[PDB]
């Protein structure tokens, strides 16, 4: 379901670090990617206080329907898009809100 600007697919942590840096290193600047160490899930790469932190997003299945969580299942989301739109308004476990989408160059 993901054709969103903030989704960069299979890219590295080092690449995400460069992409975020290249785009400004502003607080709230973020992207989502596939985890290299965990191919099952995804990583939210978030910029806060000029540093880039990485948050693992793990999938799970109940009743045959997929859902995602960043807090060991304590907070669940139907899709990554819901996870993103939600953390644009709510802090959750993040140090700041998701403010700016990090896109690839034009």
């Amino acid at each position: 379901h993901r054709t969103q600007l903030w989704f960069h697919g299979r890219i590295s942590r080092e690449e995400s670090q460069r992409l975020i840096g290249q785009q400004g290193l502003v607080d709230g600047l973020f992207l989502v990617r596939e985890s290299q160490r965990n191919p099952q899930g995804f990583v939210l790469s978030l910029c806060h206080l000029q540093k880039v932190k990485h948050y693992l997003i793990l999938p799970s299945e109940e009743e045959g329907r997929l859902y995602f969580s960043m807090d060991d299942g304590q907070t669940r989301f139907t899709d990554l898009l819901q996870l993103v739109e939600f953390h644009q308004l709510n802090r959750g476990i993040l140090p700041c809100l998701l403010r700016h989408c990090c896109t690839r160059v034009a």
Partner: peptide, 7 residues
Amino acid sequence: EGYDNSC
């Protein structure tokens, strides 16, 4: 390992 949410 290297995640801010200890995973």
